[model samples]
Target: QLPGRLGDPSMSLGTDPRTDPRLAAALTQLGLADQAAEPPVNANSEVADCIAYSTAAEQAWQTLGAMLGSQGEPSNPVDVREETIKGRGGNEIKLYIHSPTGHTSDSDPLPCVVHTHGGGMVILTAADANYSRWRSELAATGLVVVGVEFRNAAGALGNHPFPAGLHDCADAAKWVASNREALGISTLIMSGESGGGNLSLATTMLAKKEGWLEEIAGVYAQCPYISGLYASKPEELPSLLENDAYFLDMKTMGAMVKPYDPTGENASNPLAWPYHASLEDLAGLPPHVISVNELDPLRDEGLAHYRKLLKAGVSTVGRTVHGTCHAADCSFVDVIPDVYFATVRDISAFAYSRA
Candidate 1:
């Protein structure tokens, strides 16, 4: 089989990653030709699988240096703080509450944005340097940003699985709406980057299903990783992944999923992959901004999803980060502050528009 092709930057989302020739050849050889495109859930691991899964748990922890906030909250008008809420089965879900410095409920009320962090839905958290940067940059004007430190792979991946982390997020989403007085604002919103983007949409979908859409104002999913439908399509995987930077490759991306959704049974669950949602489920969603990175393996799926929502008549905003960066340490904001910062400004504008 031919090796996969690193994304052809010139190709962009305009060209479906699945349609690439390199990916088609690779999947054919892997005996994936007639594989029905649906990636086997837990495709990599049969059981107890996760990133390093307690295999390198200790090693990774020792290497777990310091998140942005670990050093201390950077100076900003947003007063960053931490709080917790009840999770499924009474597990404690943690949250980082970022509210305007002196806004009290009775005084000045601002809209609220519920944020989820991304670590491929496996081993990582909202409590990190990138998220620290997010707190400083998100809603510079004024908005309450509640960053939920939902369960992680190592933290709860094995014992907890697919909808477990999502369930935690949904509960936290409920918390954000329920505690609006304490949360310092009234408007309920949703947002997340990467895997969390997947989670954000799922939380919103679940909330809608549970008949709680009234509490939500809107959603912002930046560079979201949506589904295997696009990722595992026989044609796309190999082509986008051939570059295979050691950072996050196709195999690595494919593998990380099981830890978060170990049973693999939830592979088709909308909560796990919203792209698997029914047409009825896809319709009537709140206004959305789906931002994508040009050089990401997940790019095509994000693009496909944006189009899907538009056709379904949902309010949508499609955005793409320029040139070679998808979780390049989630480097957009840090490497090119102007471009990345402007995206957040647009997100703030979107939030207000929906508000």
Candidate 2:
């Protein structure tokens, strides 16, 4: 059987409500009652199998949130607080802010990190163990970390799919810019992993188009899925459509994205699929740091974007952690400490350099 938690079995588990009655009730209310009774699917071919896998992943992350103490009443060493910002459609969005220690004054104007969580846009949060570790490490570097819980495909507060979540992220950036003094931030950096990385890139595009880039400094996208239309090509369809490919495959990708785009129009949106974006438009964007896994399905897409950014005369750096799979930095921190550490250091340097 797979271990109860991620990483080593020796690692202690944290208390999260997703493992308790609240998550149970939430799933039940979503008509996912079968999720509670079924044995977790490891990996399968059917959409129901993917749903089950997503549910199990959600449960794991919920436990991780409880473990990291991001759930329930929020308290932290760095004076964490939550605020709701209204978005384009009047959506009240929630953001968790972690202020750097000893920088409490509004005039101090510390650097800011707007972090997005990963999990195929169906699981995980900034509170997850991996994300929390990244946040804590980044915060220690004297930057404020803001965790965004944007609208997901599974939620009712906003419509499902790509730009919907990206819109919320852009709104959060606007909120950060307008209320920088209130939040004690001077420069803003966008960062995220996996789906969150996709969100980070999408938000970067949205910020640039909407003229919000003037207020933003840089972007760090870790293992981002920049090409959602991978399976559209005949030559790419085989591997792209495979059931198991270490990172994400076509069926799971379709399941995650189809709800927001039944007709599949949103996949090509420049905001969501930056790889399809024109070279001229990409060149006009801000500085960026993109990290990818050599073994990941999105590897080619990330490298393609990195090359495009360089060609556009945009200050950009790309790193491919050799022999690693997507998000391995989170799952293999002990084995590859440099991957995680380098991410924090490089992103911080990029943000401060631009600022």
Please report the candidate that would top lDDT against the real structure. 1
Query: Worst ten-residue run, lDDT, model 2?
Result: 11-20
Model 2: per-residue lDDT, tens digit, 1-355?
A: 2222122222111112112233334333534322123233322334445445555556655664454333322123455677888998998888887765667754567788898877656556555565666676677677788888787654323335556777888888888888877777778988887778888887887777877677778888888766766435334322232212333444455455544444556666767667777775675778888888654556667777788888888888898875454566644444455665666677777667766
Pairs of residues clashing in candidate 1:
4-242, 18-235, 18-236, 68-129, 327-330
TM of each candidate vs. truth: 0.79, 0.75
Backbone clash numbers for all candidates listed = 5, 3
Residues 158-207 of candidate 1 have per-residue lDDT tens digits of 34567777888889988878887775675877888778889888898888
User: Top TM-score: which candidate number?
Assistant: 1
Q: Rate the local accuracy (lDDT) of all candidates.
A: 0.64, 0.63
Cand. 2 TM to true fold? 0.75
